[PDB]
Ligand binder design. Structure first.
Ligand code: NA
Length: 125
């Protein structure tokens, strides 16, 4: 039994827009994120992952949602962090250009199914 945990960043600006990436579900939207390494905490992981993939250092953030998946010999945990303040400007730092999408025009169906409960929550408030 081993764990695989993913730190996910929900970067939201002042205009209720979120920074998302598009995939080449050939065009579904996704949140930036990556694996939490051994010896690294969930908070340290989302900061590092965003610094590496998006070019920002999250300063003000909180746990927005936590999803668990139990498969044979593997437990998966997705940590979704709502990032409201940061240093830097999001961009395709490692070739993964993202884009700002307003929540008013976003549909959960545009994201892979795992994101459903997160999008619903984002659009409520
Ligand atoms: Na990574």
């Amino acid at each position: 039994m081993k764990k695989l945990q993913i730190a996910v960043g929900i970067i939201r600006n002042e205009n209720n827009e979120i920074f998302i990436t598009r995939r080449a579900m050939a065009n579904k939207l996704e949140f930036p994120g990556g694996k939490i390494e051994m010896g690294e905490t969930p908070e340290q992981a989302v900061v590092r992952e965003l610094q590496e993939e998006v070019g920002i250092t999250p300063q003000h953030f909180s746990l927005f949602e936590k999803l668990e998946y139990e498969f044979p010999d593997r437990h998966i945990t997705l940590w979704f962090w709502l990032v409201e303040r940061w240093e830097g400007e999001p961009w395709g730092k490692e070739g993964q250009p993202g884009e700002w999408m307003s929540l008013v025009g976003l549909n959960a169906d545009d994201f892979p199914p795992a994101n459903e409960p997160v999008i619903a929550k984002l659009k409520r408030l």
